[PDB]
Amino acid sequence: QPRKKRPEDFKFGKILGEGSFSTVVLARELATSREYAIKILEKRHIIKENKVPYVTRERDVMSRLDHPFFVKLYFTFQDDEKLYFGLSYAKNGELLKYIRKIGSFDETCTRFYTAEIVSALEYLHGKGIIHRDLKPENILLNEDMHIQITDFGTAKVLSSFVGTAQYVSPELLTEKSACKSSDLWALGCIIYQLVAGLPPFRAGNEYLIFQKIIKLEYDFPEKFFPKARDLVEKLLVLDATKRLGCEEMEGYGPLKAHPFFESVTWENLHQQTPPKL
């Protein structure tokens, strides 16, 4: 194993992201010219806010992930005040940037990028890990325009908290729980947003959004691709045991076999060339 890295090992540059308890900065490792997204955390603030379990959860999950559709944790170190996590640099940034940029995706891009997310969730769920806060903001795009999912402090490992309002599953609002199905609900929202250009549950504030969620109060624009629409209806189901892809629905086989994915080769998505946006 290589030595423990230190801040002097890098030339830091721009801020790539900001969270409540962290900041992600682009850094070039001097010895290699390699670029990394270094997530920087202030020890005192983490302790002060009782966030140690989250940071720990992230380091632990992101270390064990070994799949192209995920941001990778490459190393950690600290100084007197700070924790540094060396992450994959996803040069093209957030999927959200692209939804905004181009408005809404065509069927080819929707199908392709949905398939990668699905293929990612299949990997994640196979390891007994639930993201819990999946969204266009943490589904990033690398230089080659393949997805790289990040942001795992709120993940749960199978053998309390609430994600972003638009993507919160109903089980979370009605009994504090989360299952793999919760990610499949997030997926349903994300497909809707790729197609429609907006998340399906929208309102003046969080309360109102939550209220629409528990009543399943949303609907499709006219232009929505019919197969996409049908797929979204199989995901946005109040009963979590009845979402396509969950264990009670017999998993990812039936999900991947949905007619929306007719033209997908599931086997080597990462090797395929993404459709142009």
Residue nearest to ligand 3Q2 (CB): 19
Binding segment for ligand 3Q2 among 3-11, 85-93, 215-223, 246-254 (CB under 6 A)?
Answer: 85-93
The DSSP secondary structure of 12-71, one letter per residue, reads EEEEEEE-SSEEEEEEEETTT--EEEEEEEEHHHHHHTT-HHHHHHHHHHHHH--STTB-
On whether 88 is known to bind a ligand per the annotation, the reply is yes
On whether 11 is known to bind a ligand per the annotation, the reply is no
164: helix, strand or coil: coil
Within positions 62 to 81, which residues make up the interface with ligand 3Q2, using CB under 6 A? 71
Q: Return phi, psi of residue 28, to 5°.
A: -105, 125
The DSSP secondary structure of 180-194, one letter per residue, reads HHHHHHHHHHHHHHH
Within positions 141 to 160, which residues make up the interface with ligand 3Q2, using CB under 6 A? 150-152
Token couple for 170: 């109903």
Of 133, 219, 230, 239, catalytic? 133
Cα 169 from chain centroid (whole Å) = 15
Judged by CB, which is closer to ligand 3Q2: 56, or 241?
56
Q: Which of 4, 11, 13, 18 binds ligand 3Q2 (CB under 6 A)?
A: 18
Q: Does 24 bind ligand 3Q2 (CB under 6 A)?
A: yes
For residues 185 and 242, the answer to whether their CB atoms sit within 8 Å is no
Catalytic residue flag (residue 66): no
Q: How far is the CB of 138 from ligand 3Q2 (least distance, A)?
A: 7
Distance CA 233, CA 236 (A): 5
On whether 151 is known to bind a ligand per the annotation, the reply is yes
The annotation places the binding site at: 20-22, 39, 88-90, 94, 137, 151
Residues near ligand 3Q2 (CB under 6 A)? 16-19, 22, 24, 37, 39, 71, 87-90, 93, 140, 150-152
For the annotated catalytic residues, the residue numbers are: 133
